[PDB]
Amino acid sequence: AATRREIFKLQFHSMPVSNEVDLDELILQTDAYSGAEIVAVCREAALLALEEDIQANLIMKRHFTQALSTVTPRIPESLRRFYEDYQE
Amino acid sequence: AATNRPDVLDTALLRPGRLDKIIYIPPPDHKGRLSILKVCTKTMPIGPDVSLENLAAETCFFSGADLRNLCTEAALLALQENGLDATTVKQEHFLKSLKTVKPSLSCKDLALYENLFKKEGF
């Protein structure tokens, strides 16, 4: 959770994001996400906010809900259970 | 001659006249694993909280080389978590290093030798 907050803070430095979004709710929904996929969620939510008003200034919360439904974790739950049982 | 897979070996090499007095190198036991840990922790500064008998009870299916890796990595974790200048290896560093050193033996390999042991071949 602390690593994913630093990945989100590097990408939110450049993009114009509104203050309506909640960062803690996005951290909880992006469990089992690789670091390259958090860049892809932030890139796709900027493109979806451009489509509903070419001249866009800010990104809302509803774009992030649609962007997380399109981009999924590639890692299945069989490999998640194996790599946590190997450390135990 | 030394080998670790003696099932592949030729029967004519193991004959009276060629190669006799076969000796078995036992995978270690509890009294034996306590003596390996005293050799490795001879030079290392060990604090007086560490008990080596409790570590040897939890240790099972270890080889001799994996006991050397456990004392190496528990010593490196004391330098990481207590700075570059430290004279302390505590008991909790050894238990924290059991999560990152895994056993390299099983009952599949161990019952192979004790079957050849039983005639069959050797």
UniProtKB/Swiss-Prot annotation, chain A:
Disulfide bonds: none annotated. It comes from the Eukaryota. There is a cross-link at residue 61 (Glycyl lysine isopeptide (Lys-Gly) (interchain with G-Cter in SUMO2)). It is found in: Cytoplasm; Mitochondrion; Cytoplasm, Cytoskeleton, Spindle. Belongs to the AAA ATPase family. AFG2 subfamily. It is linked to Neurodevelopmental disorder with hearing loss, seizures, and brain abnormalities: An autosomal recessive disorder characterized by intellectual disability, intractable epilepsy, microcephaly, abnormal muscle tone, and sensorineural hearing loss. ATP-dependent chaperone part of the 55LCC heterohexameric ATPase complex which is chromatin-associated and promotes replisome proteostasis to maintain replication fork progression and genome stability. Required for replication fork progression, sister chromatid cohesion, and chromosome stability. The ATPase activity is specifically enhanced by replication fork DNA and is coupled to cysteine protease-dependent cleavage of replisome substrates in response to replication fork damage. Part of the 55LCC heterohexameric ATPase complex composed at least of AIRIM, AFG2A, AFG2B and CINP. Associates with pre-60S ribosomal particles. The first ATP-binding region binds ATP with low affinity whereas the second ATP-binding region binds ATP with high affinity. This is ATPase family gene 2 protein homolog A. The gene is AFG2A. The chain holds residues 799 to 886 of 893 of the full protein.
Swiss-Prot record, chain B:
It is found in: Cytoplasm; Cytoplasm, Cytoskeleton, Spindle; Nucleus. Coiled coil: none annotated. Expressed in both neurons and glia during embryonic and adult stages of brain development. Belongs to the AAA ATPase family. AFG2 subfamily. Part of the 55LCC heterohexameric ATPase complex composed at least of AIRIM, AFG2A, AFG2B and CINP. Associates with pre-60S ribosomal particles. It is linked to Deafness, autosomal recessive, 119: A form of non-syndromic deafness characterized by mild to profound sensorineural hearing loss. Sensorineural hearing loss results from damage to the neural receptors of the inner ear, the nerve pathways to the brain, or the area of the brain that receives sound information. ATP-dependent chaperone part of the 55LCC heterohexameric ATPase complex which is chromatin-associated and promotes replisome proteostasis to maintain replication fork progression and genome stability. Required for replication fork progression, sister chromatid cohesion, and chromosome stability. The ATPase activity is specifically enhanced by replication fork DNA and is coupled to cysteine protease-dependent cleavage of replisome substrates in response to replication fork damage. This is ATPase family gene 2 protein homolog B. It comes from Homo sapiens (Human). The lineage of its organism: Eukaryota, Metazoa, Chordata, Craniata, Vertebrata. The chain holds residues 626 to 747 of 753 of the full protein.
